[PDB]
């Protein structure tokens, strides 16, 4: 129902959100988990990973496995690995130690948790998309600005003359003769022309749009230049292995195709 | 959630970090170790190698194998090879001699360590990436600067005239006639035009981006010009051989694919 | 962690070292020796050859085979071949005669040594790399200088006008009309434009980079124009033959692939 005027006013800030909500979603569903307990929502895991970079996996006695969010600690190991994970959720404030490698059978109080990383550098994925979206929107705006410039390549300066008379000849102009300004109506001694031309480049500002889209796909992992999703895949597999070690759960991870 | 204005302000310093954290991670996981003891974290080894260039491998009595960092010595061999390795970690300050070749059975007190090199020149890998990242970011900024220049190819100088009247004709301009400035409203005797054109080259500043990315891949070893990862592979294999010689451990190294 | 500003200041002197330490290493490991005694380090041999051009091979009674460095003599043979080899190492100053061809069984006191050449002209390999590195770095700097020139193709001279007003119209410029400078605010009688254009050639300053890299590979032996590593291979084989003649050791040499 929205009228065209309601959109022409806000143009850059709509393309941006449109592409932002699209790329975020297209990322949230890049990985497919299996063998998980029916209590944890995978969508929550993926969202938290992509937004923040990490998420904890610590079983609770009453509630259950309770895939949970929170912060990391400053008390670390010799190998630059944290020790305990405090939650940041408003209702829950539980804390728990973490588990990285096995230490015989007498490892700990069996109350530890496991953490998952979006990538070895704890870098969220939104920092790339929030940029490529901006680029694509700026491009879609530049394209309009450059296409709307092919209506006004020239201007005519008619100082003393009037507009209605000058404009009606162009209205009753058929084509059997050129345009002619004659009569005492007109002055024809001050008229001039000016070249306001603007080159056409929107044919090339599209290929750039596509290049940017393909670069976003690449640096996202989903397919000049190659892309390796191992950055996001390997830590997940490693944490899955740690989980299957601590417990008896057989978890796996991979793309959707 | 970030608004476009929050990003347009900081542009070069975000692309830089984005590509930096990406290349660093993509390198940290180039090599896959096997047969190692469950006490040493390979990620720590690779990080320390790429950041500094070397890392020691000396077994401790109490803790274990304790893959450890530190400095090198000035007391060297006739073959320009150090003798002992002092640690730089804050909590640990242990020192230990090194082992390069075998000397019968009566070699030493069996308390020596082994060192691993990122490459024969002790050159860290970050020096290449910290440069290619800068190049790529500067390119992504230049591309924006050159695409945003196709909106302002010309300017109109209307000294005595006013802006609202001049700008409303362009608003109620349909297309059945050219643009016409006429009436006592306007002066039409001082208007002029200026060509502020800017060539379009962003179609070529992309191929350069891709060339730089491929060069970074090449000089990294992961695939005009060829790339040899033997620079980073051979010293690792050699140190692995030394380890399997000193001890009975069967270690190996290779890429992930 | 290094910030972009920490690198933009020092640019030429970082690329240089980066490529220098890379080419040196890539050369140190071009040849693979076999059948050697476990006392001599091949890496030392190759380093000394490439750096200086030659290295001696003289067995010692106490220490062992003791692959050693040093200088050459002025007392030469009729065939322009030296006689004795004095060492330059700080701790060792031993001297020993050399062995070039056999003279029956009663050749000498069996205390002679053998020398190895990097090439018939005693030319070290660093003289080529220290040049190609400089060329490549200068190129990587020129490319930046030429890409950063596409932001400032034109300049506008607004003498009497102010900057904020002139710059805000470009900020609230949408695209439905050209740019217009009108009002008593502006003068519009002194504004001018100047063309500061700079051609784009970085698309060709890359192919030159690649040509230089391939030339370095060629003149290094590791693969328009061909390259013969026999320059570095033949004297090594010849010295190996001399060694297998003087002693009973079966040594060999070749590339790594």
Residue numbers in the entry:
A (entry chain F), B (entry chain G), C (entry chain H): 8 to 230, 251 to 284
Source paper text:
The Portal Protein (PP) complex is a central component of Caudovirales virions in the process of self-assembly of phages. The PP has multiple functions: (1) as a nucleation point for capsid formation; (2) as part of the motor for loading the genome into the capsid; (3) as a head-full sensor; and (4) as a conduit for genome translocation. All portal protein primary structures are characterised by a common fold comprising four conserved domains: The capsid-facing C-terminal crown, the interior wing and stem, and the tail-facing clip domains.
For GA1 gp10 the tag had to be proteolytically cleaved to prevent the formation of rosettes and the buffer pH adjusted, to obtain sufficient oligomeric particles for cryo-EM (Materials and Methods Section 2.2). The N-terminus of GA1 gp10 is relatively well defined in the EM map and could be traced from residue Tyr8. In GA1 gp10, four hydrogen bonds are located between the α3 helices of the neighbouring subunits Tyr139A, Thr149A, Gln154B, Lys147B. However, there are interesting differences in the arrangement of the clip domain between the phages: GA1 gp10 has a beta sheet formed by β8 and β10 strands from one subunit and the third β9 located on the outer edge of the beta sheet is from the adjacent subunit.
